[PDB]
């Protein structure tokens, strides 16, 4: 089995700059026929992989001219010049020379370096339907921010609550190179109906002051 | 080029499942066809290969699936199939149909092997307690993955964010948001459509003001 190794795990590049992604093999990928069967793929968020470059350096159908592949033996590089936001995703390499099995690298995430952007924050109380089932989720959306690092505190009637908080980040958005995150505080209806003020506070690099949104059960 | 997979969902340990794939846009009968699965634990893993008529339909299997999986093809239907017996927890993941190694990929279907019962989602509308308004759908309590979310049956997309699911106390939760002009809501309705293939359930929840 040929082991394929990919570095870095994540790569930050400004739009219009050039990105370089590395792929190593445990053995030379030169085939008896003199060809080298090393291929590159792009898996955009929420899509399947798509073939970009085959046999080290050949662009596949529909692949723009800013993608180029190089390398030899055990050491290969994909270069993305003049990077566009739509190039973000996970890049994989695979080998077809020493098979079976056909094997894959572990993937490299291309991260676009964009200008700092503060999150747009929205808070949502529990729906009536959820309350009748005995549950009570308060949801906070922190949309279109950059960089990915962010901290969310929940406060109930002034005191921070940590138990019951579920956070989930999107991948980078190709439209504007931002991230978005959902923070959900799930209580039982029983505890929810014993408190009045629910607040999500977002702390992000773009301001020393947190962005605060708040819902009061006295609606 | 399009490859569309079907089958999957929740299978009990030891059980069986057949995945299918229909392809268009390339000369199917002259391509080796393959299944590849994707999981957090193993990454992308080639599973099985079927070759051509010329090759007498020769096959190769990954070590982890040999003797339990059977790949086959139907050149008259431009289709490839993966029959799976004695499934294990480790077989869980996203399965892609592919042409070549790997020229063309399908969109993927998901297989989960666990002794659990399938549970469809509860879908809860998120309405607020500027010139834009953000609305959402909270999808709780389902198993297995995945659900897909659209808004207005896919007619709204520019302002959509859908967040990856998180597994808590043996059940998945995810949320989706949409941001639309405030002048246009509620006068022009906004609905989230949540599909859960594994339980054969879709829920359409219109977001109405509180």
């Amino acid at each position: 089995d040929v082991v394929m190794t990919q570095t870095p795990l994540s790569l930050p590049v400004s739009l219009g700059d050039q990105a370089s992604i590395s792929c190593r093999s445990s053995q030379s990928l030169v085939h008896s026929n003199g060809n080298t069967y090393l291929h590159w793929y792009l898996q955009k968020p929420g899509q399947s992989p798509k073939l970009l470059i085959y046999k080290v350096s050949n662009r596949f159908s529909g692949v723009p001219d800013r993608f180029s592949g190089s390398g030899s033996g055990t050491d290969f590089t994909l270069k993305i010049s003049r990077v566009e936001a739509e190039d973000l995703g996970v890049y994989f390499c695979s080998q077809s020379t020493h098979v079976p099995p056909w094997t894959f690298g572990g993937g490299t995430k291309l991260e676009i370096k964009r200008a700092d952007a503060a999150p747009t924050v929205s808070i949502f109380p529990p729906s009536s339907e959820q309350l009748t089932s005995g549950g009570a989720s308060v949801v906070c959306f922190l949309n279109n921010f950059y960089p990915k690092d962010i901290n969310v505190k929940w406060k109930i009637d002034g005191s921070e609550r940590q138990n019951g908080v579920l956070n989930s980040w999107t991948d980078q958005d190709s439209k504007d190179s931002t991230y978005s995150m959902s923070s959900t505080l799930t209580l039982t209806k029983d505890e929810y109906e014993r408190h009045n003020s629910y607040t999500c506070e977002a702390t992000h690099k773009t301001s020393t002051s947190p962005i605060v949104k708040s819902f009061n059960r006295n609606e | 080029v399009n490859l569309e997979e079907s089958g999957g969902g929740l299978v009990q340990p030891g059980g069986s499942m057949k995945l299918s794939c229909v392809a268009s846009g390339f000369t199917f009968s002259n391509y080796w066809m393959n299944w590849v699965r994707q999981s957090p634990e193993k990454g992308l893993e080639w599973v099985a290969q079927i070759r051509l008529k010329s090759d007498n339909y020769a096959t190769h299997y990954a070590e982890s699936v040999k003797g339990r999986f059977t790949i086959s093809r139907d050149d008259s239907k431009s289709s490839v199939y993966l029959q799976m017996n004695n499934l294990r927890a480790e077989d869980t993941g996203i399965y892609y149909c592919t042409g070549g190694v790997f020229d063309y990929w399908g969109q993927g279907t998901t297989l989960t092997v666990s002794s659990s019962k399938t549970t469809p989602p509860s879908v809860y509308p998120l309405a607020p307690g500027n010139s834009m308004v953000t609305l959402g759908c909270l999808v709780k309590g389902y198993f297995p993955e995945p659900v897909t979310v659209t808004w207005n049956s896919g007619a709204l997309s520019s302002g959509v964010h859908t967040f990856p699911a998180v597994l808590q106390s043996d059940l998945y939760t995810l949320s989706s948001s949409v941001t639309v002009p405030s002048s246009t809501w509620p006068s022009q309705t906004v609905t989230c459509n949540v599909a859960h293939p594994a339980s054969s359930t879709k829920v359409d929840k219109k977001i109405v003001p509180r």
Partner: peptide, 10 residues
């Protein structure tokens, strides 16, 4: 385009 010819030594 990605497939290589198999080698099969006796």
């Amino acid at each position: 385009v990605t497939s290589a010819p198999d080698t099969r030594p006796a």
